[PDB]
Amino acid sequence: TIRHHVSDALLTAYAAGTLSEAFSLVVATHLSLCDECRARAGALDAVGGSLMEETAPVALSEGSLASVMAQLDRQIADPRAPAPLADYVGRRLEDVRWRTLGGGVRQAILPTGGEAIARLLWIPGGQAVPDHGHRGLELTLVLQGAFRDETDRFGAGDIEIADQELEHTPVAERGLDCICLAATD
């Protein structure tokens, strides 16, 4: 099962499109892994669709339709890395530009717009990420295995939301090797 979901407020910001790219990529990667949050967000989407339909139209310039119709095309990979993450990795998650850091962890800082940062984590076997406070909200999605930290167990597909008032030490659970996608602002 998946028990750790995208929060309502991050769903609402996803729905709106008002999220920095780092925060969108984690959230959307959780949607590709979690049908629960797809439905959660797809209902938030219904709200904007409803908003749009009831928006008082603004006319486009004369000739706009025929101009679009002229250019119509008329009658014309790693199961750990789904959705929009496959874009940032390009086949094989084990193959990126890693930086070992260094009590058993390695990371890749993923290229994004916005002011929030996006990185892959790699926490092997029984290795613990050294304790990190947060310079903002933090988002963590497990792509392989599991890890123990906060108050809970997080497994493949689960999403951790960490605040600014949170000191924590993410230790990987034994067995598989824990690969994550994280997001900070």
Binding site: A13, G17, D45, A46, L51, E53, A59, G113
Partner: protein, 176 residues
């Protein structure tokens, strides 16, 4: 179907490359996408450009549209909101894996009908909302950061649409 039955027009786009079908969707939704992006902070010239690009995607990706999971307005919106906002992102908003019905199976028409129902239901609901509540919702979608939850401050019937989507997605997975 009708000049105004968007789901059927969308299947006409899809099954027959129906261009008169596309004229109907464009003429209705292009000025509405334009007006929407302008409430989102866009200037008229760029909102028109985007509306036009949205409607071009609608024709290109018409296959991706699943009426057991969305109304047309919603899907179109989806395309509108996932555009690049330059200060937020380097490209289109990261969107999840594409789950579409293949060039074969339609979704169960009964789901489609029940999806459009729950959907009309919620449109009917948004419409009758006090204006000071409709402004809390509009702000969510127009110009506001992450410290903002809408399924938790509004009391809109989002409950059956959700399960409708969950149930729709399950059928999709069973098929695919």
């Amino acid at each position: 179907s009708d000049r105004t039955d968007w789901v059927a027009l969308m299947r006409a786009i899809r099954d027959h490359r129906d261009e008169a079908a596309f004229a109907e969707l464009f003429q209705h939704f292009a000025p509405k996408v334009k007006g929407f992006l302008m409430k989102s902070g866009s200037v008229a010239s760029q909102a028109e450009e985007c509306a036009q690009d949205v409607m071009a995607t609608v024709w290109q990706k018409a296959h991706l549209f699943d009426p057991s999971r969305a109304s047309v307005a919603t899907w179109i919106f989806t395309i509108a909101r996932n555009r690049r906002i330059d200060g937020l992102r380097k490209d289109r908003q990261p969107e999840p894996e594409d789950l579409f019905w293949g060039p074969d199976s339609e979704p169960d028409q009964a789901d489609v009908y029940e999806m459009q129902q729950e959907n009309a239901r919620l449109g009917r609901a948004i419409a009758r909302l006090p204006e000071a509540q409709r402004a809390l919702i509009e702000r969510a979608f127009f110009g506001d950061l992450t410290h903002r939850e809408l399924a938790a401050e509004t009391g809109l019937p989002l409950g059956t649409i959700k399960s409708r989507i969950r149930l729709a997605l399950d059928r999709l997975r069973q098929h695919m």
